[PDB]
Design a protein around this ligand. Sequence first.
Ligand SMILES: NC(=O)c1ccc[n+]([C@@H]2O[C@H](COP(=O)([O-])OP(=O)(O)OC[C@H]3O[C@@H](n4cnc5c(N)ncnc54)[C@H](O)[C@@H]3O)[C@@H](O)[C@H]2O)c1
Ligand SMILES: NC(=O)c1ccc[n+]([C@@H]2O[C@H](COP(=O)([O-])OP(=O)(O)OC[C@H]3O[C@@H](n4cnc5c(N)ncnc54)[C@H](O)[C@@H]3O)[C@@H](O)[C@H]2O)c1
Ligand SMILES: [Cl-]
Lengths: 383, 385
Amino acid sequence: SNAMSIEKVPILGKETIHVGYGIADHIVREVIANLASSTYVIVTDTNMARTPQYSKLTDDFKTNLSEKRPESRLLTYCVSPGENNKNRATKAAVEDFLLQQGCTRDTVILAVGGGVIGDMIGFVAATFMRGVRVVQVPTTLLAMVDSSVGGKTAIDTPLGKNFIGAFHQPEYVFCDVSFLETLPARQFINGMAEVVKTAAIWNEEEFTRLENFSKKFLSVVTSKKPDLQSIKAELVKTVLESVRVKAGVVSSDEKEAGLRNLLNFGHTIGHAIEAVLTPEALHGECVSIGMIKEAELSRYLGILPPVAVARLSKCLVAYGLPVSIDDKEFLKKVGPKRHYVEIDILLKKMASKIRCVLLEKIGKCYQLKAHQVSKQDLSFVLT
Amino acid sequence: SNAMSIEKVPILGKETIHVGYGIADHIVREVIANLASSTYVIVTDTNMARTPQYSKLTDDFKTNLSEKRPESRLLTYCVSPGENNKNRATKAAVEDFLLQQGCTRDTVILAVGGGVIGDMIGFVAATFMRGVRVVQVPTTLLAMVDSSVGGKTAIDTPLGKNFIGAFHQPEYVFCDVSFLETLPARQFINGMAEVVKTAAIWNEEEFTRLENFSKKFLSVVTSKKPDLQSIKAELVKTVLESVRVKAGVVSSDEAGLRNLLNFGHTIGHAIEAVLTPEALHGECVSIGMIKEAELSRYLGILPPVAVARLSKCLVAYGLPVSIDDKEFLKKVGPKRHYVEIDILLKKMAIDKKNDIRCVLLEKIGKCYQLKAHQVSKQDLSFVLT
Ligand SMILES: NC(=O)c1ccc[n+]([C@@H]2O[C@H](COP(=O)([O-])OP(=O)(O)OC[C@H]3O[C@@H](n4cnc5c(N)ncnc54)[C@H](O)[C@@H]3O)[C@@H](O)[C@H]2O)c1
Ligand SMILES: NC(=O)c1ccc[n+]([C@@H]2O[C@H](COP(=O)([O-])OP(=O)(O)OC[C@H]3O[C@@H](n4cnc5c(N)ncnc54)[C@H](O)[C@@H]3O)[C@@H](O)[C@H]2O)c1
Ligand SMILES: [Cl-]
């Protein structure tokens, strides 16, 4: 906000998720002051490496470290971008760099990038000398609200995604919304799927604010040179209220286990679709369609009222997301893969009951847990 | 085998370390009954794969599983032996096999082999879908008493050893002493360094037993046709009492006890870095224990008689007590001449670049103040010069 340059969210009792706009300064001081180390390492990709905000961070990091901890060193390393580099070779290359540099157990690694970087460099930190401190610095909307929080790290293999990895909690998550200034529009919209999800499963008031923000958001993000400063407060609030839900649910799952599954709203059906249509369909695009199908499932089972289905769909369309696999622009993105989406391959991906979130209303999940549903009922909504 | 065949040792208050001699059936029953899964995977190396006891274990596993869990399956995978294969490419190969065979989060992996297998397959389990259940089945003496216990897993890189890994506690450790029937003598003897070490840091009564057992142990192990069954009971006790000490230390709260396990390793790892691979780890740790004991004696802590005693016991088990041991010089050859004081000091310092500490023995079976102690480059130099 105007009144608070940094807003914090607790995770497992500690306020280590920090959100603001143009906070390189704060990131650097917080890290150096609280995570004492001989060696700090910023890891990024090529795309992020070229942006002005990235240079501001490393510059700020360099200067403060020179003042505060003269004996300590800052190191930087860049991987190539893309899901195709989220692999064993890249992990090994980052490690070989850390080892050549004589990094030890005290090393602090900052993962500056989207979910690819966050997951992969999180995993590097998880196994480096059997674990070193990592700080998540997410730079995509998706990564800011979802992937940076919860400690899930991984890489892909030629057989499938995120099959090798580790649970490794970050010391901090810093969401500097000003990084979104360079994010391509499609990726920005993709990220709103998780934002709408968190409001839909937990916060109707935020859902209302999102509806009221949609037109000016979509108008700025799709303009030629997006002016993000003009909607700065509203973007900070967007990231804040979504990550609050993710962090709250992760923390609450401690004592009320199974609340964590509510974060899967739209992912049961959406992951099944994305399995068929990746990489032409992005994850948020598939999650949006999934939330609608899953909402229709709750409706068909006599739980979600039909008006809430309509309200959810209106909000997703207003943020530029598809609400069925037959959406015209979505058909354009997926082309010849459209016809691969048959009911049978979807029921197979989702495997013989299936677990699914059943929305009760906007802002609330039915009985605060996931439910086992039959293949017959899922077939009905997918027919 | 039955209940009478098995000695258990607790780790963090649960009896998951089981020791016996000829216990493949027990291993099978215990895993299948306690670790319910669709898929059990036994991973080993070429050398172990061809031994009779390995086949006994896998045959028994197959038979019992198809009876008790007919819808489950047993898979097997074999890697090449050697520290040179304790690497990323092998870890990936094992993972690709698992994935190609459709293994999921319920998979139970058994690591049947020495410490290379234990550490590497342990690490495969640690990261597979972010972690699956692993069972350590150590087959060297060293692995039965030390490496299988404590949850440390790793592989090596060209820049050094055990740098990439994970802490991943095994569901069970099964030490079947019958695997030692096919262990080459040099490796069998190598394992005795850690056995002597555990007795020396913690259990003077066991040290006495090991002294009394030494002549017999060595004549059996170094014969042409070793008959291990004739010393069965005493070998089981040997394993049991060393792994007891490791497990008790791992189970502590009283942090600082963990460092007592490093007795012999401060100087020993430095010697090994210069002399590997011609010298084995336990051979260097033996020498290391002697020098660290001399250090404690020099500092006025350890009485001289302890150094004599330790030295006699180590040699009676076929281990060297100096870098100029006749047989040790044959193994290492021209690398001996690179063991200078400055490179040892450099390595001991590199090993503590995060944080030079050393265990100081107070007498046989007791460490001074139950913790490691900072020692100077001068005093180490004095003892190594
Ligand atoms: N850990 C979890 O629980 C979790 C949850 C959801 C997704 N994920 C993971 O997240 C990954 C997808 O992440 P993503 O959607 O952030 O994609 P991404 O990291 O692939 O980034 C998308 C593209 O944007 C570039 N980029 C990132 N930030 C930028 C910025 N500020 N300006 C300009 N360009 C930028 C990247 O170089 C890349 O080309 C997947 O691999 C998925 O497995 C993880
Ligand atoms: N995790 C830990 O805390 C820890 C502690 C100490 C050592 N280690 C590790 O242990 C490894 C060394 O283990 P090791 O000393 O068991 O060596 P190893 O695993 O290399 O085995 C030695 C040799 O014996 C063969 N072999 C093993 N058991 C056999 C048997 N019963 N019959 C016939 N052949 C057999 C192997 O194929 C190999 O050729 C090192 O890589 C080291 O990093 C780990
Ligand atoms: Cl790995």
